[PDB]
Amino acid sequence: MSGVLEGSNVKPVEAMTDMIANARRFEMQMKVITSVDENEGRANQLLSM
Amino acid sequence: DRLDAALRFQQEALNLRAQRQEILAANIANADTPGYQARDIDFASELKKVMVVDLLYRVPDQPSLDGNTVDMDRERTQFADNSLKYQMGLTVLGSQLKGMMNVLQG
Hints:
Chain A: This is Flagellar basal-body rod protein FlgF. Chain A: Belongs to the flagella basal body rod proteins family. Chain A: It is found in: Bacterial flagellum basal body. Chain B: Keywords: Bacterial flagellum. The structure is cut from a larger assembly and holds chains A (49 residues) and B (106 residues). With 49 residues, chain A is mainly α. Chain A has one helix and no strands. Helix content of chain B is 66%, strand content 4%. In chain B, helix 1 runs antiparallel to helix 2 (43-51) and helix 1 runs antiparallel to helix 3 (72-104). Chain B is mainly alpha-helical and 106 residues long. At the A-B interface, loops of A face helix 3 of B.
């Protein structure tokens, strides 16, 4: 068809849901990292005889 | 010498404990080297062999991506145990030497 230009197909609902899910997943992974680090910090005293 | 035969077992046990302590500390130090295998010795068999070293690979527990099989918890417990047994061997050897001494003092 002549006289019409096609735009993008970026769905905003999908983008918003993806951002929410990404933020929540990032926070969960940061919490896991903190837990593991604290556990190793507590565990690295056994070596004291 | 007869004096060596009495103190041979404890001296060999003490030396083997020191060697295994060095091996465990090497395992701890190289924890971050990718591709490093955790090595250890079987204390009883080597003690038989010396009284009458070969390094054995540790069986990995968790598969890492960089090929490092060193586990923190297992070797930390083994390190503490080896330290305790080294102290016990020192205590036993010192007691034997002190007894041999008080036999002579007079």
